Design a binder for this molecule. Sequence first.
Ligand SMILES: Nc1ncnc2c1ncn2[C@@H]1O[C@H](COP(=O)(O)OP(=O)(O)OP(=O)(O)O)[C@@H](O)[C@H]1O
Ligand SMILES: Nc1ncnc2c1ncn2[C@@H]1O[C@H](COP(=O)(O)OP(=O)(O)OP(=O)(O)O)[C@@H](O)[C@H]1O
Ligand SMILES: Nc1ncnc2c1ncn2[C@@H]1O[C@H](COP(=O)(O)OP(=O)(O)OP(=O)(O)O)[C@@H](O)[C@H]1O
Ligand SMILES: Nc1ncnc2c1ncn2[C@@H]1O[C@H](COP(=O)(O)OP(=O)(O)O)[C@@H](O)[C@H]1O
Ligand SMILES: [Mg+2]
Ligand SMILES: [Mg+2]
Ligand SMILES: [Mg+2]
Ligand SMILES: [Mg+2]
Lengths: 240, 55, 385, 244, 152, 242, 125, 54, 390
Amino acid sequence: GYDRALSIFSPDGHIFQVEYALEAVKRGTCAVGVKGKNCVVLGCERRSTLKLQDTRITPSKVSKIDSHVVLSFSGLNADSRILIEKARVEAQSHRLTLEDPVTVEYLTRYVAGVQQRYTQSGGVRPFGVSTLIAGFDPRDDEPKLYQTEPSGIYSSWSAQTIGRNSKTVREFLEKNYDRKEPPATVEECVKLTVRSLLEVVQTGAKNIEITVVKPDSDIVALSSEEINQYVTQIEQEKQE
Amino acid sequence: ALMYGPPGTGKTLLARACAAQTNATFLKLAAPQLVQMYIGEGAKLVRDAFALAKE
Amino acid sequence: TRCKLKLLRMERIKDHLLLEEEFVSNSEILKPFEKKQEEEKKQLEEIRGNPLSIGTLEEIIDDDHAIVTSPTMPDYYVSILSFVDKELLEPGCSVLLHHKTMSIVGVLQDDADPMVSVMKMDKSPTESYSDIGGLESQIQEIKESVELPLTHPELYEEMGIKPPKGVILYGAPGTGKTLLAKAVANQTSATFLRIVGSELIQKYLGDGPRLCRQIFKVAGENAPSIVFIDEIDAIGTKRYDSNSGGEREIQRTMLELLNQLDGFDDRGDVKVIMATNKIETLDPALIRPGRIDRKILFENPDLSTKKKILGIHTSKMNLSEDVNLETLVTTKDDLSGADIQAMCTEAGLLALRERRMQVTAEDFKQAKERVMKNKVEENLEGLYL
Amino acid sequence: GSRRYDSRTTIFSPEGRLYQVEYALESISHAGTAIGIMASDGIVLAAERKVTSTLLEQDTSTEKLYKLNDKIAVAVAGLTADAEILINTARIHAQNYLKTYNEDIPVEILVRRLSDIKQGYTQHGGLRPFGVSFIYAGYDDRYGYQLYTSNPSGNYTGWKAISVGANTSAAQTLLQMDYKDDMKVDDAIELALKTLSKTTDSSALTYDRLEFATIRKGANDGEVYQKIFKPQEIKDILVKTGIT
Amino acid sequence: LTKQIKEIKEVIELPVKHPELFESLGIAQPKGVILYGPPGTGKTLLARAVAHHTDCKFIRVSGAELVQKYIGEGSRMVRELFVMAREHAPSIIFMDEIDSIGSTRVEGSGGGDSEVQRTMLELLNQLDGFETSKNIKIIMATNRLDILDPAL
Amino acid sequence: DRGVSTFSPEGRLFQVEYSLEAIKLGSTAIGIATKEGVVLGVEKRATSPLLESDSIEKIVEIDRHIGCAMSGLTADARSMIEHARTAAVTHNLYYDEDINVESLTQSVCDLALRFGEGASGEERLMSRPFGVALLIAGHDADDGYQLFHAEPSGTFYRYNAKAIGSGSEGAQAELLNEWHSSLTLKEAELLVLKILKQVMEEKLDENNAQLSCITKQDGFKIYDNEKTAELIKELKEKEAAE
Amino acid sequence: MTDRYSFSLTTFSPSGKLGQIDYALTAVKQGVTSLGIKATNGVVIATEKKSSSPLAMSETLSKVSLLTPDIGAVYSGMGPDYRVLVDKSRKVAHTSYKRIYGEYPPTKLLVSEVAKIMQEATQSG
Amino acid sequence: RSTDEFNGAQLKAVTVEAGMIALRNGQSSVKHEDFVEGISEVQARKSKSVSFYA
Amino acid sequence: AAPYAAKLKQTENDLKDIEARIKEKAGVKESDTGLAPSHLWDIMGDRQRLGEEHPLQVARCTKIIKKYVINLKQIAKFVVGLGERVSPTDIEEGMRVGVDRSKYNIELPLPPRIDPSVTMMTVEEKPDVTYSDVGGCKDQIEKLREVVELPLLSPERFATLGIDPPKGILLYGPPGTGKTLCARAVANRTDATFIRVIGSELVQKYVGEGARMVRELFEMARTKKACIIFFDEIDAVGGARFDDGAGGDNEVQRTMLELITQLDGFDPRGNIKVMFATNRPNTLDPALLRPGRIDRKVEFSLPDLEGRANIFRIHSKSMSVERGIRWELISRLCPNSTGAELRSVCTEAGMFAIRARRKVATEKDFLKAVDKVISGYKKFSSTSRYMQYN
Ligand SMILES: Nc1ncnc2c1ncn2[C@@H]1O[C@H](COP(=O)(O)OP(=O)(O)OP(=O)(O)O)[C@@H](O)[C@H]1O
Ligand SMILES: Nc1ncnc2c1ncn2[C@@H]1O[C@H](COP(=O)(O)OP(=O)(O)OP(=O)(O)O)[C@@H](O)[C@H]1O
Ligand SMILES: Nc1ncnc2c1ncn2[C@@H]1O[C@H](COP(=O)(O)OP(=O)(O)OP(=O)(O)O)[C@@H](O)[C@H]1O
Ligand SMILES: Nc1ncnc2c1ncn2[C@@H]1O[C@H](COP(=O)(O)OP(=O)(O)O)[C@@H](O)[C@H]1O
Ligand SMILES: [Mg+2]
Ligand SMILES: [Mg+2]
Ligand SMILES: [Mg+2]
Ligand SMILES: [Mg+2]
């Protein structure tokens, strides 16, 4: 019944709703991604700070899709739930029919696929969501980081940031992550990801969540103590 | 008698040529003049374009 | 303290001496004046007598006649005679006629208007640049096109080419646009005209076009000048009915705004300064660069610029060692400069309610909670969509 | 032609916001107030009706408190009609899980599925968003007592306390002071009446403008009990905190 | 209504009679003070009582052109109302902008009544030395301050 | 809102005029077809030094003798590449034979036509768009190397050479002088880079350019990023002899 | 032919509340009066009869009806939307309690079935 | 013949437009070759845009 | 603090005490025009000032009755007669005349209509834009010279052919190409009276108020021989033919109809050349753009890539520049750019020479300057919308 066209072309060569899509993303939360040479690190800041608000049962903004894929999302949070759902569905129907877990390349197309296909039908608004997709290719060591648009475009990155105040942290990353020399270890990368967030978080360790995915389905989160430790370290050094 | 249609058909050109040629006294009037900014000077211009014409 | 009073006494020994000297030499010391000034005043006064009837000149004839119209009504075909220059005679001008035989005995009449009062300004702002300090390089583009060709004629003859014209101010609100303008008019000390863009829409129809042709004839006269059209966005919504606004009134204002600033007219020096927060409604015949040269783009400042900004406002307030100036800046995460200014007006409003006359660390951390609650109560998103 | 008549609920604004959704968040704050309080020893679910007339049969009515299944109760804020749809759709989904796993639905699951339904109305199909928000109060083995709230956007978050309906900011600051993490069930009851007796727009807080229900693990042999109190036991604890 | 009487005697009378109190503190002098609430609560009758003790000329402005005869409309009157109220300082200009005339003008433009109060506001915030010595107060009144144009 | 349905009383479907703008926004894509090897080269327009150059794909394989380069929004194109891939393989099940190059263009052009109101049960699975061009290049026995230009109009022509994208106007005027009928593969490959250098925003490098051909023996083959760096280096020697 | 009110005709006001719901009550307030008093051992419901002429005999029209043998019902507001609403009610009472429990529904349950119709007459376009 | 849907005002706009072409060359007589060529110079036509799909 | 508080109270009283005594004394002190030659004028002008030469109460004739009927401008009607020796041809219909102050009798007739005066302030006095100022050597600039300049300087060549010379010409296009830059140029060179009008000057609330104006302007241009009447910005009062059925388009369409009936005229126009500078031919009216009044219409084009290489020679030769700035090099780099934006690269390299502290603008300050003005003034498409068709 409803199929009224929402991709009214802009005479200036655009589409009004796909600009607006990009705008809604900017409103929402921030999240940063950086790829060492043997790890990926997804940090995101959490406005779930608010005395008397749990974090045990409240869902974190970094989601598990598969054993060795992880997603982080900025933009409308009602909407995030869908793209998780679809991707999970996918991940199993790939094992079923072709065997072997999803190549991180593939799953990127597939999430990207879904967001494009909401601009085609009239009955539906675009998802105002951009995402970071990360994982390690089956039985390999190749870090991969991918980010998609609510346009539907996708590309791999050395590190990227989406959400609010992405310009501050991109400008920070140009100077401080060399393109020829990734951070060597897991601790050196993590120190680098904290230092990027602590520009727009305005200190605190309670705010930020840091999850690391390594090769061989190692999805681990750093707990409050660890966060604090790293922060403090960056405090002494910086002060000195 | 009214003359209407597309522009270029010489509506204004013919009428003039044939009303001066037949020696019938041809008064020149343009409607935008009957519009006025005084209150009641347009009603006094129509009766005066008429009173001249009865003589 | 002493600096100010030495100079103020120095100008009240100048004013006193000059007034006594200049009064005594108009009423006692007459030698280059005397005979020759007593004869000239006696001849002009006797010849035209009084009362003198002011008239208005509709038109001149070059054989020394004029058609003047009294403002009462009865018209007159008067003569141009004796003790008159034809350099100032011209349409609209006020002449003196002799109340019997009306001959133009001279022109000296210019009678100020309450329509030239609203346009012209008497002000002299009590802030000058570096009370705007921060966003430092945004007033150092408005000084390259307003101040700098008046001050150094040398540099713009040395490169050649025509000089810049105008600027538009647009961008985030709370970025100081209104005080930025109030500073480039105080530095130069050129004749600063000032009009809001919302007076150009009036209930009266077609009165728009007459009002801004007036504004530019006043401006051309006093040139060099700066015109502030503050809020030219306002012309986009303000309307009283649908024909006192609508396509009709908005096209009349465009057309007018287009002629004043660039037309056949071959305008003298009007620099134009516009304050605005709508760039995507303006005429595309103005943000045509080459009327208006460098446009200025303003955004929310960053954390080190907001350290320069909070230091201008906090010297006003009482100062203590307790105060934590650096931690109000850090926590704010690209928040505008209109809030920073609503927080120091809120610190002395809590201070007065107590009747404690020290502003300390406690009064500033309380005033930040009240400033973050009004803008955050108006955010009814609650659970983020 | 018909495109003119189309409201376009679906479309994004130039803010990127769904203006329709923001309106819906309004229609909650008109309706009467409901407060969630988590204790370690139980969950006190407490909400004061919006209705008030002197002819209301308080004994007969529930309208703010519904049971979902035996472990999970919701408190409703908004339009009651809208709600009633969702509340039946919940009840069927609870049961569907019970037939397939012989294991009562975990509280996270049930909330997540309600939230998905809501979202869908504002994705596509030019429907008007539901004007409703729930407090979820529920118990399982996994995490213990759990509290959640979901709003008409389709986005839910957990909590250690929360309030929906009118005077949301007022309620939230009273709780910020007073709640300590250790409370029993009986102290938790007393903080709930306290927070409702200040905010109430009507002058008196009366036993027939209140609805109170508990979920307690102080039922022996390791079993949970619900109980919605009668209007005649809420009267006995209104004199207990001295409101009368 | 005892809580309202003090709130306005604080911020209106005290930076006029004692500019020394507000200058030490540093607080930049009050501009606009919005009076709102439901009609019949005495929104206007409160500023009347403050205009009698302080000795303000209470000039109720309104959109009425019956009094205006010199320019004949108040759409462009700004300087003249100031220049009469600056002579006869102190003054309270009680700008009642109606903004309840229906959704034809109030939701179509932000009303015609706020149009005149926003031209006032921008020019009286800086004009001569009166900007932290204003003796002409900008008292606004409305049905709910929410209904006013957001930029006010 | 304009309909998709409505006519502009000039005689025109407003929407087609707006589509043909979207081509021009997107990145440069040159194609020169000779009688010895079609060369396609595009400008990637890497937008940050953080982003990895080679993940971006704008030279795309349709089958093993029809290669294709796209300009415009790369998203719109994701649907239309997949449709084209299926159809060419469908034909190879059905006649055990290379799909004609011309025929494949037609099927793409047919999907392009679709954007309709979606009246009754009829399947128009788009309501809008397809603001992208293709340089569909190929080789078959019937006609030699060919090259075809698709529009979002549903309109295509054969072309000896065609530029499209941001620098289309400039590239067009250099092509009408330089194009000839005697070009070799090795001369055409160097000539494409020279016309692509003028309208490249940035300096000609292989970290914002990608070259490809289709040649009779090889089929499709995109070049190595090492080969391309060498052809850049040889252009500047010939130019610095002059 | 083709429905092109697939979209919903009810939406929230930029001031909060649904615009048409509010209107719908003002139409109920115009209506005929009627009343209800609950007693200890019975209920009483009763309405007046408003005709056009004494030619119109109002005996034939019934404004009080039976849903089931034990549940009657009375109304105010739009005469025709009562005619169908009672029909819809009787019919879906029977297809949700007459087959699946034999007995006529308890009185709470029947009220709730009616309530589903209303809500839903606002959700569909 | 070589005109159609020209109103009389365009056609006065053709015979003058031809005798300019004669003043540009320098000729003192306007030949039958210039009246043909003035027809393309004043048609109320310059075509909105070369076709792209018609 | 206290020692200095007693000095802030004096500074306040003292600066205003001084201020009042100084402005009343200074006055205009009796300064009245005339100066040093007006003393010899006093001999001549005292025997004439007493004569009744003046006043002649200015009147206006309402009816020549084959004696004369004047109507004073006070409303009171009188029959007057000939003067000292005036010809009976002078007295014409609707002409003003001066009559003897006492017993009314025509002394001296006077020129007509006292409504001209809002039409004599629209006439400009030789602009300074010269004729080589305009860009390129286009053939389009010679078409301006073949409709206006050439038939008035030599009406010998358009008399041998026999053609009615083309009198109109329309200038239209995208902004920035100089529609007003070539209409100033042609007002300098032709030395024919140029009469600029603003088409949005006519509008008032009182209907057919712009009817009076349009009449009298049209007569004022008829009297002087060789004129050019340049109507700018006629998109207001030059709109499409429509009839809303409810608005106030009724005032607007009055001033257009009065503009129509004089142009073609009962009595054709008498050496009037017509210029129209419009932004668009797209909303312009079907009775004004219909071709006897427009004649030959030349749209001024966006300069090509050779037209910007030409224009770039006017702005870079006037700056101080090092030798060897190929004007082709900066024209390529630039995208498709008007000449009003190609003037702004000189001005942005002139403001960057001052920042860098250079006495010369070089080929380095122009390469940077291109990058800044092409980005900057390209982004954001004013409204980025427009349309309003469907
Ligand atoms: N039928 C015709 N025969 C010869 N010449 C014609 C004819 N129609 C128009 N013309 C020429 O066109 C000129 C312009 O026509 P005119 O302007 O008088 O006509 P119109 O219908 O009144 O058009 P409009 O009033 O719309 O301008 C005439 O002066 C004449 O030279
Ligand atoms: N970058 C800055 N540096 C120094 N002071 C600032 C800055 N930004 C704002 N301020 C202060 O904030 C005050 C309020 O600013 P003003 O009212 O002039 O801002 P605005 O941006 O003009 O607002 P609007 O968005 O309503 O047009 C200024 O008068 C000024 O002192
Ligand atoms: N062809 C040109 N050659 C040299 N300079 C030009 C040319 N066209 C425009 N200019 C320059 O640009 C300036 C401004 O352009 P102008 O104001 O004439 O635009 P316009 O064509 O009248 O547009 P509109 O009337 O719609 O605003 C001129 O004063 C001149 O310096
Ligand atoms: N606080 C009060 N004390 C005495 N009279 C009051 C008070 N408030 C309102 N009134 C009375 O109610 C009427 C309305 O007052 P007004 O100030 O004009 O109303 P509004 O808020 O609609 O502008 C007056 O007659 C006034 O005397
Ligand atoms: Mg005619
Ligand atoms: Mg401002
Ligand atoms: Mg009042
Ligand atoms: Mg112009």
